[PDB]
Amino acid sequence: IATRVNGTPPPEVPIADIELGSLDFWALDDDVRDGAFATLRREAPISFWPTIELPGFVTGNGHWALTKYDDVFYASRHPDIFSSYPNITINDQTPELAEYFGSMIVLDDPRHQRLRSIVSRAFTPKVVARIEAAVRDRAHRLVSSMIANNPDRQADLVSELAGPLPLQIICDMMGIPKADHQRIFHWTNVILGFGDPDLATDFDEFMQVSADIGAYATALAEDRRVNHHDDLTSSLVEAEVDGERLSSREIASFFILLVVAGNETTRNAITHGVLALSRYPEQRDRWWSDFDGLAPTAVEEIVRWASPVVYMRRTLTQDIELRGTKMAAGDKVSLWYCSANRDESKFADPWTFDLARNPNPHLGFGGGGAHFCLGANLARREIRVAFDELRRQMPDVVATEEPARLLSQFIHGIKTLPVTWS
Ligand code: HEM
Ligand SMILES: Cc1cc(CCC(C)C)ccc1NCNO
Ligand SMILES: [Cl-]
């Protein structure tokens, strides 16, 4: 595809053209989206928007959009005010889906910390360092297979590498048999792709997929309750929180959170990273000339640039005012990481994709504090190893078409990215 000029700011977007409540807005290209958030940061840093109407979802009240880095950081660090209960997407959750989506991410402390403590050891730096060889093995073989399977030197990066790598890693951590990885992939994509006609627009399919992955979780849990294995599902069924085992719905919700969180966002970080190296070849050249020296900053700049999670939602527990804006107890609040990560008052040259950027206190893993991404160290490893394997096996891998972008307010997804190599 065409490259662009690195450092170019987005087009001006008049504030009257911005409709965060319309699915059509989220189909526009990233230049327009980035320009819209730049206009909000400048002219309306806290503003109120209707909730997008999705067939079968509960619309409910609209939300206050926090677009400034400092406000997203403030909300994240004050959970006694900005609660993660009852949901962390904007749209209200049906009582039927609460059975499958009531994990620790929609809970406050103390119960959130008790739940997180069941699995946190498995994601600490020493424990993930052990997973590193498996990441290396899977990434090496996926890229080798891309080359063996495609003598025409053309393939889809998403289906051949970015998707399978994080999926295989988290499924093995969970104890899921390899035969079932494609069902997990499909379920993940329906749950986080709803509203995109290429994935699912029918709510019956969304509820069927939810029910099926919940039933799958429950059967695997029952098996592990009979026969322990060295995996996260056995951890879940063996835990006790003050002498009480987790309920079937708590187990199903934990399993679904871990599986979905563990593959989709990393997949999109890799695809956006390859697209950026394609658009800014100077950065590829710099990184390839010193891979290990630049990898720390390069991986962080890929996450800042991609912002794979566009926003997370909070709910006020009390009246507050910020920047002169009075917000009421019970109001929804949306935290726009995609905007915080272009905030001109926090980042020098925010429109420059600079793989040497340092410091880089981006909010791609959230604003910090109680819910800080459990998998951040694992994600950074998977990204660094995927790019090292591309450098080694197909260093000129480059996108040949513009991405097919996922239609989503929540996930900065790429459905397909055709690439070519020498
Ligand atoms: C580049 C990849 C990733 C990105 C951009 C990302 C982003 C995020 C964000 C924005 C949050 C919410 C943070 C907050 O509310 O303050 C989060 C939470 C979480 N992430 Fe990730 N994540 C990534 C990879 C992973 C991986 C590989 C896993 C492995 C399972 C994972 C597991 C989780 C979990 C379990 C939570 C909920 C934590 C809690 O509620 O305490 N994430 N992530
Ligand atoms: C994309 C996403 C969605 C959610 C809520 C949706 C359900 C499936 C838990 C939670 C975490 C993440 N990702 C975090 N880390 O990848
Ligand atoms: Cl103030």
From Swiss-Prot:
It is an enzyme of class 1 (oxidoreductase). Gene3D superfamilies: Cytochrome P450. One of its GO terms (molecular function) is heme binding. Its cofactor is heme. Keywords: Fatty acid metabolism, Heme, Iron, Lipid metabolism, Metal-binding, Monooxygenase, NADP, Oxidoreductase. Belongs to the cytochrome P450 family. This is Methyl-branched lipid omega-hydroxylase. Primarily hydroxylates the omega-carbon of a number of methyl-branched lipids, including (2E,6E)-farnesol, phytanate, geranylgeraniol, 15-methylpalmitate and (2E,6E)-farnesyl diphosphate. Also catalyzes the sequential oxidation of the terminal methyl of cholest-4-en-3-one into (25R)-26-hydroxycholest-4-en-3-one (alcohol), (25R)-26-oxocholest-4-en-3-one (aldehyde), to finally yield the carboxylic acid (25R)-3-oxocholest-4-en-26-oate. Cyp124 catalyzes preferentially the oxidation of (25R)-26-hydroxycholest-4-en-3-one diastereomer. It comes from Mycobacterium tuberculosis (strain ATCC 25618 / H37Rv). Pathway: Lipid metabolism; branched-chain fatty acid metabolism. Its EC number is 1.14.15.14, 1.14.15.28. It comes from the Bacteria. InterPro entries: Cyt_P450 (IPR001128), Cyt_P450_B (IPR002397), Cyt_P450_sf (IPR036396). GO terms for biological process: cholesterol catabolic process; fatty acid omega-oxidation; methyl-branched fatty acid metabolic process. Heme binds at residue 373. It catalyses: a methyl-branched lipid + O2 + 2 reduced ferredoxin [iron-sulfur] cluster + 2 H(+) = an omega-hydroxy-methyl-branched lipid + H2O + 2 oxidized ferredoxin [iron-sulfur] cluster; cholest-4-en-3-one + 6 reduced [2Fe-2S]-[ferredoxin] + 3 O2 + 5 H(+) = (25R)-3-oxocholest-4-en-26-oate + 6 oxidized [2Fe-2S]-[ferredoxin] + 4 H2O; 15-methylhexadecanoate + NADPH + O2 + H(+) = omega-hydroxy-15-methyl-hexadecanoate + NADP(+) + H2O; 3,7,11,15-tetramethylhexadecanoate + NADPH + O2 + H(+) = omega-hydroxy-3,7,11,15-tetramethyl-hexadecanoate + NADP(+) + H2O.
